[PDB]
Amino acid sequence: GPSFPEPKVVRSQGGLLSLKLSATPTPLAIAGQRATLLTYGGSFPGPTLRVRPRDTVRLTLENRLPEPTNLHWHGLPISPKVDDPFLEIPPGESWTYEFTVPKELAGTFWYHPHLHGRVAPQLFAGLLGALVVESSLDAIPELREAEEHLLVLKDLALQGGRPAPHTPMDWMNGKEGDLVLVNGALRPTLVAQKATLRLRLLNASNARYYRLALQDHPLYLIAADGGFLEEPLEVSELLLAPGERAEVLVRLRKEGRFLLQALPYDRGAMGMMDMGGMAHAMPQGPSRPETLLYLIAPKNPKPLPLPKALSPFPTLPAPVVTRRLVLTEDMMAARFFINGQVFDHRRVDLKGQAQTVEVWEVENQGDMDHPFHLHVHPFQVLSVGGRPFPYRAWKDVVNLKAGEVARLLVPLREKGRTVFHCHIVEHEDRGMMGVLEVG
Ligand SMILES: [Cu+2]
Ligand SMILES: [Cu+2]
Ligand SMILES: [Cu+2]
């Protein structure tokens, strides 16, 4: 097939994407070996859903797993009656998710399980897929003429032909795997046919971080989690935390082979160590460098000029409340807290008012990175760690290194009960989640 593996795409037809999608243990060939994963649509990753604003999505999820599950439409500002984090689809049962794609939306989003307590094993076993919202901006020549690819960054570990089980230490750190894959393939080769590439990036890992760098090239950031930037932003590297998305332009200036690497990154994962005195926790340190893919430039490459502008970011109304949400950890217990509390599905933690804007100060007082995710209501990151954020774009995950405070501008959109949580999904399963009610 094509030298570059990418998930199969399902496009909306006539303004409607209607599809039956089963969650099922699936035998398949993965990184040169046979394994049984948990998949949507018989594939890992699941199929990419490509839609346009104002399309209708009708996704009937059939649960063929031996455990209950549900779907989070990660990043979509839709009703929490649809993106329902509390719904349980029992084994053998089905549920139809139906929503309209918002008019003012563009970018790379994704779908995955969100049944509290089972998210980490279900997502690790392979239940995830992408959703792309096409934009009229994609028709400008600087984007139209680029060669576009989706890169689903997800790692895996196999044991006896199945996803490796979670250990106690996995529940503390978040589980990372030794197979560091792109679109389910082990270090694929991308033989570019155009000198400009448009790469949609998805970190769908449970916990692994990707400190992205392309040999000999900068990246041109054009979209964050949930929308375009106002203009391209040149970066030498790009950290993608669990759950985050980004889109970059790559401008191939010379012929040659270039590595896309996940450079060493210390996210504060811990191990255990015993030097006489009994065992005590010790930092794992930075991750080993990983090669993600091989990028081959075309002959005599003449890249397109970058777009001068993308999408103006909306001027938001003045905020009416400031929230403070403090993240803490009890590592040896693998318990994780927001303002000193663990998740309780019956407890409402924040009550806000639709169509107002709030300032959320999220403070990481732990020692690990925690990627903070808010459902339903995309936000503008104003600052992290006291540094002004270098661009304006909708995000829905923000990474917090130990000690850092992020200031977020949060317009409240759809009414109903939704959640916020760490997107190291083990931490969510172990209690680092709270409930927001919007009325
Ligand atoms: Cu998510
Ligand atoms: Cu969630
Ligand atoms: Cu966390």
Tokens 């393939």 correspond to what residue? 185
Distance 303 CA to ligand 1 centre (A): 34
Ligand nearest to the CA of 202: 1
Among candidate residues 284, 358, 288, the one with its CA nearest the CA of residue 322: 358
Q: What is the DSSP letter of 355?
A: T
Give the tokens for residue 195.
């000198």
CA 66 – CA 122 distance, rounded (Å)? 11
Judge whether 72 is annotated as a binding position.
Answer: yes
Tokens 């070996």 correspond to what residue? 33
Distance 236 CA to ligand 3 centre (A): 26
Q: List strand residue ranges (DSSP E) for 236-320, in order.
A: 238-240, 245-251, 257-263, 270-273, 280-283, 290-296
Model resolution, angstroms: 1.8
Ligand nearest to the CA of 369: 3
CA 126 – CA 52 distance, rounded (Å)? 26
Judge whether 422 is annotated as a binding position.
Answer: yes
Contact 61, 97 (CB under 8 A): yes
Judge whether 217 is annotated as a binding position.
Answer: no
Q: Do domains 1-134 and 312-439 have the same CATH topology?
A: yes
Q: List strand residue ranges (DSSP E) for 275-356, in order.
A: 280-283, 290-296, 321-330, 335-338, 350-352
Ligand nearest to the CA of 128: 1
Judge whether 74 is annotated as a binding position.
Answer: yes
Beta-ladder partners of 364: 327
CA 74 – CA 56 distance, rounded (Å)? 17
CA 63 – CA 113 distance, rounded (Å)? 11
Q: Domain spanning 135-311: which CATH class is it, in words?
A: mainly beta
Give the tokens for residue 35.
């394994």
CA 79 – CA 105 distance, rounded (Å)? 15
For every residue of 146-160, DSSP letters joined together read: SEEEEEEEEEE-EET
* Burial class for 96, CB neighbours closer than 10 Å (0-12, 13-18, 19+): exposed
Domain ranges of the chain: 1-134, 135-311, 312-439
Rounded to the nearest 5°, which phi and psi values hold at 299? Answer: -70, 135
CATH of 1-134, one of 1.10.10.10, 3.10.580.20, 2.60.40.420, 3.40.50.300: 2.60.40.420
In b/e form, how buried is each residue of 6-23, taking b as 16+ CB within 10 angstroms?
bbeebebeeeebeeebbb
Give the tokens for residue 86.
């509390």
Judge whether 427 is annotated as a binding position.
Answer: yes
Distance 203 CA to ligand 2 centre (A): 14
Distance 298 CA to ligand 2 centre (A): 40
Distance 256 CA to ligand 1 centre (A): 36
Beta-ladder partners of 21: 61
* Burial class for 67, CB neighbours closer than 10 Å (0-12, 13-18, 19+): middle
Give the tokens for residue 431.
């209690």
Give the 3-state secondary structure of residue 60: strand
Judge whether 375 is annotated as a binding position.
Answer: yes
Judge whether 345 is annotated as a binding position.
Answer: no
Distance 236 CA to ligand 1 centre (A): 26
Judge whether 280 is annotated as a binding position.
Answer: yes
Give the tokens for residue 204.
């769908």
In b/e form, how buried is each residue of 376-400, taking b as 16+ CB within 10 angstroms?
bbbbbbeebeeeebebbbbbbbbbb
Q: What is the maximal distance between C-alpha atoms in the chain?
A: 69
Contact 130, 150 (CB under 8 A): yes
- How far does Cα 1 stand from its chain's mean position? 27
- How far does Cα 9 stand from its chain's mean position? 18
Beta-ladder partners of 397: 373
Ligand nearest to the CA of 123: 1
Rounded to the nearest 5°, which phi and psi values hold at 170? Answer: -60, -40
Contact 180, 155 (CB under 8 A): yes
Query: Does CATH number 2.60.40.420 belong to domain 312-439?
Result: yes
Contact 294, 190 (CB under 8 A): yes
Distance 241 CA to ligand 3 centre (A): 11
Judge whether 149 is annotated as a binding position.
Answer: no
CA 183 – CA 199 distance, rounded (Å)? 13
CA distances (Å), 326 to each of 344, 352, 423, in order? 17, 18, 15
Q: What is the DSSP letter of 354?
A: T
Judge whether 377 is annotated as a binding position.
Answer: no
- How far does Cα 127 stand from its chain's mean position? 13
| Structural method | X-ray
CA 370 – CA 386 distance, rounded (Å)? 17
Element (H, E) at 96: strand 94-100
